[PDB]
Design a binder for these strands. Structure first.
Ligand code: CA
Length: 179
DNA sequence: GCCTTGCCGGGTAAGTTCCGGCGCG
DNA sequence: CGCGCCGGAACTTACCCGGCAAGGC
């Protein structure tokens, strides 16, 4: 709807990237379901990310608050919502069936989260190789050549390197898409 | 000459799961 | 009683950064 689907895919890229989906068990039988995006800067969160999450929450009739919690090392945007937790967890599941619009939005969010930011090089870091392999195939379909290697042998972190030969296509189509 | 990109260590910006409390049928 | 939101934060490490050099054209 597809204001919503595009924004959803983008937020998921931020959540998977910078972020998390948590199902918590307490005593008892208490529980909590969290959608989380963390980020160093309060401004990026408050003026860019939160209004996107708020739009989605309103559109989904989710009754939960957007919480912004200050940590010692970063800010946390958090929505405590069973319904939103499952919306994103099922979407993730999910992810191979994304259309072109959701593909581009997801990759954009994932790059904002896990991205080389100078743009001198175009690189995405993640330990989830299968996720990078999905993104690699999508990028190939969009004709951005790319390679995946184990970058950090210490922590098992993969890099997806976007070929600078296809830099203009990647930055124009994905990273500065008006979609 | 100039660009690209694999490699690889530094260290902080992420991530994850605890806690005490309250809401609501 | 049985679960699900709220607000916080303690703790560990997964990212990003960025320099070096092999390799391609
Ligand atoms: Ca990030």
């Amino acid at each position: 709807n597809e204001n919503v689907s595009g924004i959803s895919a983008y937020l998921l890229g931020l959540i998977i990237g910078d972020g998390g989906l948590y199902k918590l068990k307490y005593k008892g039988n208490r529980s909590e379901y969290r959608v989380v995006i963390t980020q160093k800067s309060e401004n990026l969160i408050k003026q860019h990310i939160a209004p996107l999450m708020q739009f989605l929450i309103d559109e989904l009739n989710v009754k939960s608050k957007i919480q912004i919690v200050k940590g010692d090392t970063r800010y946390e945007l958090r929505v405590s919502s069973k319904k939103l937790y499952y919306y994103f967890a099922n979407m993730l599941e999910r992810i191979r069936l994304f259309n072109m619009r959701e593909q581009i939005a997801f990759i954009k969010g994932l790059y904002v989260a896990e991205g080389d930011k100078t743009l001198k090089r175009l690189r995405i870091w993640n330990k989830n190789k299968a996720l990078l392999e999905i993104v690699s195939r999508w990028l190939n379909n969009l004709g951005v050549r790319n390679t995946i290697h184990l970058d950090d042998h210490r922590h098992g972190v993969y890099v997806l390197n976007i070929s600078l030969r296809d830099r203009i296509k990647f930055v124009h189509t994905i990273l500065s898409s008006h979609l």
